[PDB]
Amino acid sequence: DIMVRLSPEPDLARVVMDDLLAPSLLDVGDYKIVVEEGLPSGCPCTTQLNSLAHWILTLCAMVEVTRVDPDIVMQESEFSFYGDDEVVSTNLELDMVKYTMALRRYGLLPTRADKEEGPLERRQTLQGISFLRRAIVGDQFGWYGRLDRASIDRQLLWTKGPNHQNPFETLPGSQLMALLGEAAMHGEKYYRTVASRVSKEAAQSGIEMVVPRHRSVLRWVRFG
Amino acid sequence: PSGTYAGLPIADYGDAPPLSTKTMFWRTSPEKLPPGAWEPAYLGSKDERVDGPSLQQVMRDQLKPYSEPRGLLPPQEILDAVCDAIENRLENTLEPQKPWTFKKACESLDKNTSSGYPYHKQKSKDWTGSAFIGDLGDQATHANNMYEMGKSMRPIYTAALKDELVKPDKIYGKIKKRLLWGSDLGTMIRAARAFGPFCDALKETCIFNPIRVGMSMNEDGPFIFARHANFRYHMDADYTRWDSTQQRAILKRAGDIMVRLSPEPDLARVVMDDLLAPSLLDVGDYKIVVEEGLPSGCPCTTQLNSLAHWILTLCAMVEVTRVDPDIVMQESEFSFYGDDEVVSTNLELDMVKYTMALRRYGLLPTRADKEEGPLERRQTLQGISFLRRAIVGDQFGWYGRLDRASIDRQLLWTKGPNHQNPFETLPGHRPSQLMALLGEAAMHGEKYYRTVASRVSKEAAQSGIEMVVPRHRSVLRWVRFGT
Amino acid sequence: DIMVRLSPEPDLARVVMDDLLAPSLLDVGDYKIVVEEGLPSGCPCTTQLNSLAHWILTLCAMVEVTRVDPDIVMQESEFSFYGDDEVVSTNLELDMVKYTMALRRYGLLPTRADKEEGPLERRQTLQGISFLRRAIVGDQFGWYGRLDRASIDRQLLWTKGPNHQNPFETLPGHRPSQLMALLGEAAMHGEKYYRTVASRVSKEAAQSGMVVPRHRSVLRWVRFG
């Protein structure tokens, strides 16, 4: 309804949204079944819609805990929503017990990092939080998001290509420089490791590639 | 052979010898023990002090914790960052070393301990003063050739029980005897050649790095404690079952650090992979498979354990404070000797969440009052314990002082050959240990020094020769300030 | 008196100290004059003696200011004395006004770093204070004393040799250990200054007839080694 009211052609978007949010027909191959609830995550705009829903739910929980009007929360808070992914920063003293209780009451499934039962954790610093598979870090140059180490090693182990049946087939056929950049934000040690791996790899395939110094590629990815 | 021994899988049959029923501790005088005094641990079915279980049952009781579910692993980003920080600090601190020869690795071993599998022979029985010969010589040569070839060998550990003075409740009440891991000569030599350079280079910087393995309390102690006292808050977690509760992944990170700093990294990688693989412990009846815990048999096991302790502590502090590990490391001073720690820091640490993260990692920290709850944090270094010493400070500086009870114990008990009745009086020599005891007693004042001096004079005037009991001030100056 | 009473032959040392502290005969070339006061800084022990005097004076001022006993001062404080050079660390709440007043009353001439009149400055951190012409610095590895930059550049500009008249004459002689020690002292200032000093040393070695290590190796050698 928000998206329609904010659209330049509200009646046509109203019809399209009513069609989108009606009980959906999912084709599982054998039959077409009717899914009445959940999110139909197929449409191109589904990410914005999902993010707006996340925003609504979060604000609702905070108004249920603080009992103050949503504008008060929203002027005292900064939200970041990408579908199911969130980062919530706020100045209000939030009772995390009741916050988690209200979240679980809505049907949601919030989880602690230790995967144990109990209330959600709130920290006094943004460092360490994860967003878009990256960790939020800060230094004398400012804040940044750095891809975790597992994803870098993983993309060093696997490359994308045409569809095949045995995942352990080696492909006899860019991304390496992006991996080098993402590894530069982890220090000179990990950069040296990744640089050795890429140098050994690219000398077994295609063409040679310059392996920059840590400081140069770090400068390029941080301050472009 | 299949089955389950003490909750742990069975792999093969046991070639280990029977558990020792003797003790090395002798009484110094035929007088009656004071009530509540300490006595050597339970000695088996032949122990005439109590009727207790078999030593096999006590070893089973000590092996039960190794079957227990592990704790949670720290967050991966924190772990990677802290391991990189530790490795970088060691690179900045450690002096590069030259690879160890077979001769140097063979001369580094203690020849008064068992060779382990398969001979269980005292190393000195096949020692020439230069290299190994005989059975132990062939074992050593095979281990060395496999080391040079970069080929893997699986270590076979031998289980034993520790002979030591324990509180009487551990003898006349619920009987307990600490579990010891002995290693085989081949694995000893492999680990020596691999990590001798690293351990020695770490020992040369026992003052500037928290791994305090190899330090001398009387010479290097005061500096360590002044460095600690430069900081605001001080704590000691005093973990219970440190080795049983360790996770092999943390030990693998520590071993990666130890290998990356070694002069022969490819060979040390193979040796560490062999050390940290599922361990084969020989409990006498069977050879069982211990998949987790710490195999505390190898010569480098102390450095490895200390590094793991460092990793875990830093991880917990970074998980609570969310500040970078190097920032912690310049705002903190650690002292680690295996399971023993002293942590000094300026950061305002939420001891509740700190203890929560520690218990989440599988560790078992205990309060001083032995009651459950959060860890204690103090604003002074005074009272903290490290290497069985108490940290004290005065106008001359800081120092480590042996407790009074330990002094009384060493006055009551002396080490000698293995016997069956701990209350037998030793007719033999301790002319050197006694002077050290006099020095340790001097740090308690002239009264306690007079008492200890009376006891020493009485003990040496009823036996052998004698010695001149120096003035309090002279021996105090001698033990405090190097002479 | 302290130094004599602690010597193994106190009666023999007494006469020598009485001779040392008596009105001194200073030879200024034309005459031998009588210096009744001051410190005769010629004897081998003159530094220790001076330092002991420094100790006394410092302690006196503090007990005159704090009104607490000197042994309590000394167990609640840490002193460092090298003749006229000192570093005083203490936990006592010290009125720097009365401290400087008592020092100037004793004939001493304490000076601020900014060369302005007023009481002495006390800081809550040991970092930055100077002792033996070196600065006290601390890092994640511990504390250390590092020679200032000006002295390093000066020793790069000036070298010791035989006595001559024109200070701007260039010495034609071809210094190993001196330059290596200078490289070490420059290493404790960071890789930037170490690179500059290393370039200067190499350039000064291309006019004569060593291995210039990486910063980290020499840094570890001079810090821990």
Author numbering:
A (entry chain B): 263 to 435, 441 to 491
B (entry chain E): 8 to 436, 439 to 492
C (entry chain C): 263 to 436, 439 to 473, 476 to 491
What do the authors of the reporting publication say about this deposited model?
Norovirus (NoV) is a positive-sense single-stranded RNA (+RNA) virus belonging to the Caliciviridae family. VPg covalently attached to the 5′ end of viral RNAs plays crucial roles in viral protein translation and genome replication.
Continuous electron density was observed at the base of the palm domain of RdRp in the initial map. However, the electron densities for the side chains of VPg were not well defined, whereas those of RdRp were clearly interpretable. MNV VPg had a distinct helix-loop-helix conformation and bound to the palm domain of RdRp, and the binding site was relatively similar to that of EV71 RdRp but far from that of VPg at the active site of FMDV or the thumb domain of CV RdRps. A face-to-face contact of the palm domains was capable of forming a dimeric structure, and the trimer interface was largely made up of the thumb and fingers domains in the hexameric complex. The crystal structure of the MNV RdRp-VPg(1-73) complex showed a more tightly packed arrangement of RdRp molecules than that of RdRp molecules themselves; a hexamer of RdRp molecules was surrounded compactly by six neighboring hexamers and this was mediated by specific binding of VPg(1-73). Further, the interactions between RdRp molecules in the RdRp-VPg(1-73) complex were distinct from that of the native; interactions between Arg329 and Gln389 and between Asp91 and Arg411 of adjacent RdRp molecules were observed in the RdRp-VPg(1-73) complex structure but absent in the native.
